[PDB]
Every structure is written in C-alpha cells, then in structure tokens.
C-alpha cells in the first residue's frame, strides 16, 4: 500500500513543510511587540 | 516500513514534537502583536 512508506516520507516532508512555515509565522509578533 | 521508517518515524515524532514546541511559544505569542 504505497501510501505507507511513500506517504510516510510524504508525511515527513509535510511535517517539515509545516515546520518551515510555522517558523516564518513566529518571526512577526516582533514588529509590534518591540514598539 | 522496517528501519527507514523507524528513522523517518523518529524524525516525524521529532518533527511533531518540534512542531508542537514551535507552536508553544506560537500559541503563547498570540497577543503580542495586538495591532
């Protein structure tokens, strides 16, 4: 059921994608927080 | 789905842990920006 090891790697990729996006989300706040 | 997975799963677990860590902070940031 290729959407097992392939989805696993795809999920691994997805998790990494989410981590990269979340890290960008965390950069702001600072623009108003540090005013 | 034997070893490679175990590593990807370890990475996924780690990514998932990182995702939540990334998120807390994130959900603890939410009303810093305000405006």
Interface membership of A8 toward B (CB under 8 Å): yes
Q: Closest Cα partner for A15 from B28, B4, B21, B25?
A: B21
Deposited experimental method: cryo-EM
- Taking CA–CA distances from A1, the nearest residue in chain B reads B1
CA-to-CA distance for A12 and A17, rounded, in angstroms?
9
DSSP SS3 for A32 = helix
Do B18 and A19 contact (CB within 8 A), yes or no? Answer: yes
| Reported resolution, Å | 3.8
Q: Does B16 touch chain A (CB under 8 A)?
A: yes
């Amino acid at each position: 059921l290729s959407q097992a090891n392939v989805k696993l790697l795809a999920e691994n990729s997805s998790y990494l994608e989410k981590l990269r996006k979340t890290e960008e989300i965390l950069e702001e706040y600072e623009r108003r927080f540090q005013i």
